[PDB]
Design a binder for this molecule. Structure first.
Ligand SMILES: [Mn+2]
Ligand SMILES: [Mn+2]
Ligand SMILES: [Mn+2]
Ligand SMILES: [Mn+2]
Lengths: 385, 385, 385, 385
């Protein structure tokens, strides 16, 4: 029942199941994991792949020999399991050098270092088979209003992403970029704080088609926004290159709960959308097994992620398949919503008297939308009633 | 001291000082105002202009004779005072017909009615002298996940804005459109919920250059976002067509407090940005005099709005002019932030050994950003210390 | 399946299913309801009772003859259906006189009027059979810091509740009082903003035992707080006199969605607590059928409320009954949590070397809490997997 | 100008200026500080005292010899400067043993260890001169609903605080306890999440008079609550034993910005209240110098804290002293708010016809509260206009 299989495209970061449990107020509650053990245990669970930061795989400051050896080990384990690496990313946030940002650090040399550090890991991402390269600008921001001229910072952010797009263009790489937005934490306000701000930013890049969004459930909910709506707008724009799934209990610190926790109904509507829309990219879980757990709880957490996706997937499909739902959708005119407002054209619209001078504004006002009956049907399918 | 004058470009909606005090839990605490009296009292205060919804000026359902008479009165008062009308908008939210939206109402005929209702008021806006026409889609949204297919809704939203852009193009009008984003209320989630989502949406329109944003202080703060940063990104994109100023005490219902209340420091940084960047559009106050006030408190509220702008304007200018601030900005490398990261080009960057192999990551990590001293200087100027 | 019956104790306010749909931005989308029709339609649905404000039943300003007639009608309908009135309340918020508060209005005569208005409705509540009288101080608060001396306001709030407690004591009434807390809206900050603040306030009253809390799901979630935890603390203190059930999607305006919407998991844990703890008071639904609905949607909304309670009640019971859950609870030491920490006494504790000098802090640190497996079991039962 | 002196009662934790800069996503950006250096540098700045956790002063796991030596050093430095230690606290949150709580850890032996660890530091706090002992239950809580039976947890919390109260009673100590509330982080929901919940909890303790609250600016604002109002309610209840001052930009992770940042107006009203009410306890700053700073920025941060208090103190005093403010307060009837509502008694109230039957509800409704003019006066004094 609800057993995950690699065709489900479930992926996990090395940093997720390998989180040692240090939080702002606490020390690690778990010993570090061998990336190789993660690969094999995740493959046993039914995962489709893993993702990594450069420094999850290669300890910061490794000479090429060590680095090569760390990669050969990781490469070996993927070979033995058939595990994919669909996405990679750079750690531009842990090391104190990045304390004011990577690509938008006030210090010019830190910015050039961040780009060299990322270019090095793009080569490795592509060699390992990554379709998407993620930019999380967790340190691009400020705690106070004078510390960052945001228009200059967006110049530097644009300049960095333009250079990376020129790099993958000159190398011949197929990889595309996804910005992962976050409204705040660890900076007091982070640049490109929501899906929307990142989508707007991409349109100003030099090669907009190389760039998409990698939205995370909990980051949009940290702004109180509706994650299914924002995903729908990324899909609408054609930019849902990737997605991070997890749970969040509203506006507060980034919890990275497992997927299905936090906002259960929004997780349902998310799965309904991803499946209805035919999203075919990774179902990536960017979660943190709570530091209250041992390693047995870490893997139970990872399995819950996939399991909750598959239950929601089952309930959303039965919702859409249900003829009572089909009838309720028509009673609430979701059909009419897909009809062009004025395919007859502006001039036709302007001369239509039934659209204004002779519009029965009160007969129209009196037609109930029947949204409650529809929603209680969605509730019944979610709960299995 | 801090007396407002029409060159300051301070404008007010008819619905602001004319709010009668009905809230979700309460009846009106003030009698309705004559638009004409508003015009004259605001001109006495030092306002530069007024804005209106169609139904603030012409009672809904007025035959052309009444409508013409209401406009002749309003036209007369503007003539007598020299008051400008820089912006207008349509009321697509009060009347029960709009209970599921205007441009994205599930009901097709309501959508066509909303467009005819807006086209009629565009003609009036232009005749009265409006540079900007604002779309607030307060009813475009949902309370539940199945009630609205967001990708279809954005099709209809795009189709409506494309038709309005075709309308003003065929008439020869100079007017441009500004979306006013709002994350929620009166709908549980509103489409295009932030500056960012609206900027992304505009890039998909057919004539993107006709459309900008009209951001409101309190709406971005209802998502917990940094209003100065989002304004900086609108400015960066070249889309700050208009702006709504007011106060908001964080994430909660839309308060529409007067400007300067709510987040005092963010109001300071906002004014610093608008003035540094050279924004030359209206300083529009979309506030609500609390229903605790009489009409004497209504005008004191309107005056406070302008007064708090002018005090902040004075403090932000002295901040920038202060050589100690100038030195602190250089100590925090805001200068370096304006320097191209790699004007030498990708290949130069790639072969720079001082940007990676020979980067002293620890000397760079050890340089303090000096943001605290900078911010305490901004605090001292704000408070006049 | 999940059909509600009067033994379930489901009650509804006259103002819930009778909400006409006016919100801050919109006009009514439904005609007013006859209280008598509400009584009969709710009884048909399976409700146990109704609640009312004075002005939901008697139009404000009714001479005694009309008032008597409105009560005789309502009394008649209850007789015909067997509908209970377990709780009543006073409207101290709609009328403009209450614009700065009722019991804490700065104006002394408004305060005395509020008490007379409430005393009049206490007599009616008791005659109709009310066990609980609710105080919602929606207008007790401020939009700005100088407008209200909060220590003086709490003096007046205490003085009002002390007088009402002296009133019901002298009349011989069995009725008890419940404060319904709300953090904000319609005032910018409301006094006694959470369950906790109200519980603290009651301890300073003269007859603390006459007063409890009437918490609402959405009001605590408007502060981002955990409604099951706060209910647990009310229960712990012995003060859960009543409860308002509904849905809320986080920190934003008060939505009054139907129960089960908003935070689905928190609704589950709430029902688990109310049923485990043996709460035997009303399951009162203080919700608002969205103004998008017609009267058919209003009753479907009311039925959904009761239905979602009964599904959650079924899932929470199967969770507790499940031996796998029982074993998981013991693995996570919920049993140990119910054990006195030091029933052996302070001196025994102080001389226990195994509690400090010889405590294996690292064997204890290494025992995983097994909370993930427990929570995935709760998820499986909720979803029916 | 605004130079702090020890009579101002400004205190700082060892953990504040000694924060090394590790956050959930980052490594330390500063080397550790010698407690002794902190004492001397803070005394040079004008501080009145320092506070500590046990493990800020004595490295966890120190034999008595080391421990004694660490205390002799710290004792020496206080002697040389005259620095007070008004408050101490226990670290029950860093070490992995406390991962599920201290006093409410599901594991009974961890609970007994937490009490022994705290009792040991109470002896040291008193010897060093502490008036207040603070309990921050940062690990008392849950991430999921089944992991903690909140009623049992409050039994254990009550049992622990009852034992500590029995301990200081038997030793003859003058010290009193203050709970520092926090709504969330590092746990998903923390028990006793607000000032109110903690005040309610104290009333159920065995010796309620030994216990007060230690509220923090940022923790109540993380729930979106009004920190001046909650402080007013602590003062009203007679429980403001201590207070933590800092800045917070709304609902998001705990920022611990320096005091005066975050919500500038609320900081003003806070100082106005503390000074008007005559609070005479420590002005304790529980802030974190951002990890972007070097040690020079750390001390500039600490100085800004005290400086912003003294500027606000100056502006609030001039506000209250201003006869125009005095007149505006009377126009808004803050005077009437301090008048007993019904000192004439219930029966007098009940027979007053001018309080109901003959109340001019509409003349009263028509009197404007004049809150806007009052608030703009408070704004003018704050900004120095
Ligand atoms: Mn995250
Ligand atoms: Mn607004
Ligand atoms: Mn409510
Ligand atoms: Mn804090």
């Amino acid at each position: 029942n609800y057993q995950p299989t690699p065709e489900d495209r479930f992926t996990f970061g090395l940093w997720t199941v390998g989180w040692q449990g240090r939080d702002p107020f606490g020390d690690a509650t778990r010993r570090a994991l061998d990336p190789v053990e993660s690969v094999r245990r995740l493959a046993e669970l039914g995962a489709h792949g893993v993702t990594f930061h450069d420094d999850d795989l290669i300890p910061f400051g490794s000479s090429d020999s060590e680095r090569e050896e760390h990669v050969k080990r990781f490469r070996q384990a993927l070979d033995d399991t058939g595990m994919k690496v669909p996405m990679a990313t750079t750690n531009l946030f842990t090391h104190p050098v990045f304390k004011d940002g990577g690509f938008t650090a006030n210090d010019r040399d830190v910015r050039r270092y961040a780009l060299r550090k990322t270019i090095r890991n793009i080569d490795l991402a592509v060699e390992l088979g990554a379709e998407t390269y993620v930019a999380w600008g967790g340190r691009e921001g400020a705690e106070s209003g004078g510390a960052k001229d945001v228009r200059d910072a967006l110049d530097r952010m644009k300049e960095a992403f333009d250079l990376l797009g020129e790099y993958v263009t000159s190398q011949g790489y197929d990889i595309r970029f996804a910005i992962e937005p976050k409204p705040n934490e660890p900076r007091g306000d982070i640049l490109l704080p929501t899906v929307g701000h990142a989508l707007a930013f991409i349109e100003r890049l030099e090669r907009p088609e190389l760039y998409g969004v990698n939205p995370e459930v909990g980051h949009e909910q940290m702004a109180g926004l509706n994650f299914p709506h924002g995903i729908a707008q990324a899909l609408w724009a054609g930019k849902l290159f990737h997605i991070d799934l997890n749970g969040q209990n509203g506006i507060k610190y980034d919890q990275d709960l497992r997927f299905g926790a936090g906002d259960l109904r929004a997780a349902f509507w998310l799965v309904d959308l991803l499946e209805s829309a035919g999203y075919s990219g990774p179902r990536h879980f960017d979660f943190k097994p709570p530091r209250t757990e041992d390693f047995d709880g870490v893997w139970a957490s990872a399995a819950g992620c996939m399991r909750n996706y598959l239950i929601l997937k089952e309930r959303a499909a039965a919702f859409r398949a249900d003829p009572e739902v089909q009838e309720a959708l028509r009673a609430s005119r979701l059909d009419e919503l897909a009809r062009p407002t004025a395919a007859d054209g502006l001039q036709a619209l302007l001369d239509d008297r039934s659209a204004f001078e002779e519009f029965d504004v009160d007969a129209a006002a009196a037609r109930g939308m029947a949204f409650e009956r529809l929603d209680q049907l969605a509730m019944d399918h979610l709960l299995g009633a």
